[PDB]
Design a protein around this ligand. Structure first.
Ligand SMILES: NCCCc1ccccc1
Ligand SMILES: [Ca+2]
Length: 222
């Protein structure tokens, strides 16, 4: 996260770290058994770490749970990073408590201008901000016009832009798969962008609100 502030510890209890030796992507707990992340973060098996604040120090609030199933959206395309969403089933249910709580799936698509929070342990590109401690950032959802203008012909129905066209504040590598929460609901998943915090290059996010059918059906299928 570039240009944000350190999240208050456990203020984003749905935030999870996907670990394969080291943290490599974020994700969001949507219920005791399932985590939503980005398809470009796909790995056959991953260890989901919940209840984290500082990912390099044991705080006593963590739960490390291995994945049971990793399911990429059927239409995910590595050629253009389209339909960048994936579900991870936990091999054992997460224990919900003060440090671990699920985030609600959207009841509808958030309109442009809606203020959201994006968080993660990715590149901060600053000498002050320690990426081992969860970083937070408030970003507004941009209109399709603004999004298409920045990335001509690259924005599909499954993508939306959020951030600032002036740059300076953005999600970055390592934040991939993480949450974009607006009005208490998961509206986006950190997906792609040109660099981080560059003017004219806002972050691109998977549009969760158009995947409710797939999400609901898959979470009921085994
Ligand atoms: N806001 C940038 C998010 C990081 C990213 C960029 C390009 C491809 C994958 C992730
Ligand atoms: Ca920790």
């Amino acid at each position: 996260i570039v240009g944000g502030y350190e999240c208050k510890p456990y203020s984003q209890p749905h935030q999870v770290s996907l670990n394969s030796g080291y943290h490599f992507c974020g994700g969001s707990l949507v219920n005791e058994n399932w985590v939503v992340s980005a398809a470009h973060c796909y790995k056959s098996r991953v260890e989901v770490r919940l209840g984290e604040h500082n990912i390099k120090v044991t705080e006593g609030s963590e739960q490390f749970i291995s994945s049971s199933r990793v399911i990429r959206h059927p239409n995910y395309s590595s050629y253009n990073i389209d339909n960048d969403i994936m579900l991870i089933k936990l091999s054992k249910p997460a224990t919900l408590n003060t440090y671990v709580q699920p985030v609600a799936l959207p009841t509808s698509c958030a309109p442009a201008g809606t203020m959201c929070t994006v968080s993660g342990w990715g590149n901060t590109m600053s000498s002050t901000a320690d990426s081992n401690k969860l970083q937070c950032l408030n970003i507004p959802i941009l209109s399709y016009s603004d999004c298409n203008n920045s990335y001509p012909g690259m924005i599909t129905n499954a993508m939306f832009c959020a951030g600032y066209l002036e740059g300076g504040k953005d999600s970055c590598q390592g934040d991939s798969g993480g949450p974009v929460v607006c009005n208490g609901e998961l509206q986006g998943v950190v997906s792609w962008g040109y660099g981080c915090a560059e003017p004219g290059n806002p972050g691109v996010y998977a549009k969760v609100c158009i995947f409710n059918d797939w999400l609901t059906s898959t979470m009921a299928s085994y």
